[PDB]
Design a protein around this ligand. Sequence first.
Ligand SMILES: *[C@@H]1O[C@H](CO[C@@H]2O[C@@H](C)[C@@H](O)[C@@H](O)[C@@H]2O)[C@@H](O[C@@H]2O[C@H](CO)[C@@H](O[C@@H]3O[C@H](CO)[C@@H](O)[C@H](O)[C@@H]3O)[C@H](O)[C@H]2NC(C)=O)[C@H](O)[C@H]1NC(C)=O
Ligand SMILES: *[C@@H]1O[C@H](CO)[C@@H](O)[C@H](O)[C@H]1NC(C)=O
Lengths: 104, 180, 127
Amino acid sequence: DLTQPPSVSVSPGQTARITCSGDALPSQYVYWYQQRPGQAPVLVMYKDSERPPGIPERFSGSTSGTTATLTITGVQAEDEADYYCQSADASTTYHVFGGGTKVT
Amino acid sequence: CPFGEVFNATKFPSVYAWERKKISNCVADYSVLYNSTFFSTFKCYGVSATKLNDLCFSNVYADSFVVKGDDVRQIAPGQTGVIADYNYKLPDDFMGCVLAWNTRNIDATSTGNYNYKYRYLRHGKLRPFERDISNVPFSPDGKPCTPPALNCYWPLNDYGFYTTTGIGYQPYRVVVLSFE
Amino acid sequence: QVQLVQSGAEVKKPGASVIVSCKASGYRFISHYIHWVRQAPGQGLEWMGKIDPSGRGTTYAQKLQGRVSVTRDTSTSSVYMALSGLRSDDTAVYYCARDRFPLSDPYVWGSPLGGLDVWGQGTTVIV
Ligand SMILES: *[C@@H]1O[C@H](CO[C@@H]2O[C@@H](C)[C@@H](O)[C@@H](O)[C@@H]2O)[C@@H](O[C@@H]2O[C@H](CO)[C@@H](O[C@@H]3O[C@H](CO)[C@@H](O)[C@H](O)[C@@H]3O)[C@H](O)[C@H]2NC(C)=O)[C@H](O)[C@H]1NC(C)=O
Ligand SMILES: *[C@@H]1O[C@H](CO)[C@@H](O)[C@H](O)[C@H]1NC(C)=O
């Protein structure tokens, strides 16, 4: 079970920290997805610290114990999207999704 | 018993900050492990690894970490090195199974996987089944220090796993089952 | 050219079984897992189940077992999902998504599944 805050309200310029806590994550990766409203999600971070090509150099994942963290340094006006975190049940079965975070 | 929560877990820790996962209050099959031929060590001390389905233990502790290919042989009772001394020591009366398998396709990026750390300097030898997650600057004369300085080193070094290496430098995920 | 082409939109009755397809192309089909994720309108993402396309097994959600059934067709490079006995809560946009993990040699156990990469366009079904 992975929980996260429902909304983060940041003006353009500050730092948005989308935390994601789950008790079954000392040993599991967190995969972060953004979904602008209307279309499919886009994978933002994978394996807690790694960023695929096409994702700009503002996102920077972290994991401190049983708590993930995505950081948007220099938030622009096209970052208004829902951010979800992913994990498993400390096996690699029953992938779970977070509650979502509408970053504004 | 959940053995996928130990073996099929995605993120193993480093060898210096290893962790136990207690397995309790469940029926254990043990036969998902010795029916697989891809294990490269599977060395059991005390038990004979096929007579495990008729033994009821008090608790099973599963120590999970990642070592180098040539560092697997230091995970044994009585062995010594830089993994058995400073990082992870097994007791001389160890009753359990040491399982290891070659995770080159997971933990060896071709750029270099500098995320698994081992301790190469310490003041003394670890007691069995003990842990040292402290990262303090190591000075060999005992005084507290601050790098960069002469006779002053950080005690943790990186494995640095590469895809294009031999099987003595490839990453090997190690699960040490301890029975009581 | 990696892409997962799904089916079209549909309307159903509360109890009528639905079939949503996911045609794959470009990448080596039996390599990557194919996940199934739905999304209720106004709600967050919900993970239903996965499939290993080389017939090695299924896994479903813990509150959807006995209802969802996925299957694979290696010849057509397609993955179908069957949901039997829909309710009013099973109105969602149904996403077929890939896996960012090339599966290979036997199955190097310890692997990072998840990381849904090449998400499909989304089939919307309404009960
Ligand atoms: C660690 O995970 C691996 C694979 O991951 C699995 O993926 C799916 C297939 C689901 O089963 C998930 O639960 C799981 O995350 C496990 O390997 C799998 O083991 C099972 C049990 O033996 C295999 O099923 C059998 O396979 C034989 C040989 O093909 C068939 O004849 C049988 O009819 C039956 O299907 C399964 O094939 C195998 N899958 C892979 C990819 O190797 C592993 O057991 C698991 N370890 C633990 C301790 O849970
Ligand atoms: C392991 O193989 C033996 C062969 O005799 C079989 O009886 C047993 O059921 C197998 N275990 C599993 C978990 O498949």
